[PDB]
UniProtKB/Swiss-Prot annotation:
It is an enzyme of class 2 (transferase). The active site is at 84 (glycyl thioester intermediate). Catalyzes the covalent attachment of ubiquitin or ISG15 to other proteins. Functions in the E6/E6-AP-induced ubiquitination of p53/TP53. Promotes ubiquitination and subsequent proteasomal degradation of FLT3. Keywords: Transferase, Ubl conjugation, Ubl conjugation pathway. The gene is UBE2L6. This is Ubiquitin/ISG15-conjugating enzyme E2 L6. The keyword Ubl conjugation applies. It comes from Homo sapiens (Human). It comes from the Eukaryota. One of its GO terms (biological process) is ISG15-protein conjugation.
């Protein structure tokens, strides 16, 4: 479990995707990772967003758990950094799924909001109905809470 996680960790730190920075495991726990996500989608591209990836002791039979620690204003994340990400839901989780694929799909989600099945519906509606107003909302919130962009 820690054995699988460490090698996944090493492989990603060595060859990171461009949208993933400061990938490292917690000072103490090897089954918790932290990373900055760098969205490209305005206005989130102004800041970087830190996330906590937790591996359960059962991993890879059980799916890992991702949350944002940095606050983000987004249709698909709640105020506590929670997300619905199919690839790591229990319904869908497959032990042969790697963490890099999890991270890829999260990057996709952040970049391309799912308006059909959102976490924050008002936000989904806003984004469909007044994209420019959404953008102002997300921007102020990004600038206010975002980690500086590398």
């Amino acid at each position: 479990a820690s054995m699988r996680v460490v090698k996944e960790l090493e492989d990603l730190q060595k060859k990171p995707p461009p949208y993933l920075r400061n990938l490292s495991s917690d000072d103490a726990n090897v089954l918790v990772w932290h990373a900055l996500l760098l969205p490209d989608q305005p206005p989130y591209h102004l800041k970087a967003f830190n996330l906590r990836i937790s591996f359960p002791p059962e991993y890879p039979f059980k799916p890992p758990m991702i949350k944002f620690t940095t606050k983000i204003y987004h249709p698909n994340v709640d105020e506590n950094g929670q997300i619905c990400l199919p690839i790591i839901s229990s319904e869908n989780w497959k032990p042969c799924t790697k963490t890099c694929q999890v991270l890829e799909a999260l990057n996709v989600l952040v970049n391309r909001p799912n308006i059909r099945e959102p976490l924050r519906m008002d936000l989904a509606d806003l984004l469909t109905q007044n994209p420019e107003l959404f953008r102002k909302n997300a921007e102020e919130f990004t600038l206010r809470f975002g980690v500086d962009r590398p």
